[PDB]
Amino acid sequence: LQQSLELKRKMLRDKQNKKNSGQHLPIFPAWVYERPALIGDFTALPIGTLPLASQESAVVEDLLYVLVGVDGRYVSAQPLAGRQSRTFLVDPNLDLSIRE
Amino acid sequence: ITEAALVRDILYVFQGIDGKNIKMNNTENCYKVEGKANLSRSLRDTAVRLSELGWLHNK
């Protein structure tokens, strides 16, 4: 996750030495990269006793959050957003047929 | 067990997701129905006739 700060460092020095025939490339303020800004993802009921029809009816709204990057209520995104792809934490007591 | 349960589990088994009581994947090649329900006709005997619709999907 962090290394993009270093890649941008190597890059901008290299854009400078390609543009040794010039000067004054633009750059964004650090808040553009530090703030969560446009990034994706970041007390609930006994769902094991919540019955099978309603259990689907509860899960299907969380997908409508999770499809835009919001941590749902069940089925919530993991830390280590790093590497190259996400993983998610759908619960151990949700019905196996719904989990799959 | 009841007839309704077996209709929804079949609606998942038409894709490859296991039901609660039709729970066998295609490994030994047929969705073995399970449970101490008796009631052969729909249960043991019809569900297996339908499940092949799913076996042909997994492949």
How far apart are the C-alpha atoms of B6 and B3, rounded to whole Å?
5
SS (H, E, C) chain B: CCHHHHHHHHHHHCCCCCCCCCCCCCCCCCCCCCCCCCCCHHHHHHHHHHHHHHHHHHC
B29 with B59: CB under 8 angstroms?
no
How far apart are the C-alpha atoms of A100 and A62, rounded to whole Å?
16
How far apart are the C-alpha atoms of A31 and A43, rounded to whole Å?
34
How far apart are the C-alpha atoms of A18 and A27, rounded to whole Å?
16
Query: How close, in Å, is residue B35 to chain A by CA atoms?
Result: 17
Nominal resolution in Å? 3.6
Q: Residue B22 CB: number of other CB atoms within 10 A?
A: 24
Residue A60's alpha-carbon distances to A73, B13, B52, in angstroms, are 11, 20, 28
How far apart are the C-alpha atoms of B49 and B42, rounded to whole Å?
10
CB contact under 8 A, B20 and A100: no
SS3 assignment, position A88: strand
**Cβ neighbours for B16, distance < 8 A, ≥ 6 positions apart:** B25, B26, B54, B57, B58
CB contact under 8 A, B17 and A97: yes
Q: Residue B15's Cα: distance from chain center in Å? A: 11
How far apart are the C-alpha atoms of A96 and B58, rounded to whole Å?
18
CA atoms within 13 A on the CB side of B1: 21
Q: Which residue has the tokens 């997701």?
A: B17
Output DSSP code: residue A92: T
CB contact under 8 A, B20 and A97: yes
Nearest CA in chain A to B11: A97
Q: Which of B37, B43, B47 is nearest to B10 (CA)?
A: B47
CB contact under 8 A, B12 and A96: no
How far apart are the C-alpha atoms of A42 and B1, rounded to whole Å?
42
How far apart are the C-alpha atoms of A92 and A89, rounded to whole Å?
9
Residue A23's alpha-carbon distances to A75, A90, B19, in angstroms, are 49, 52, 66
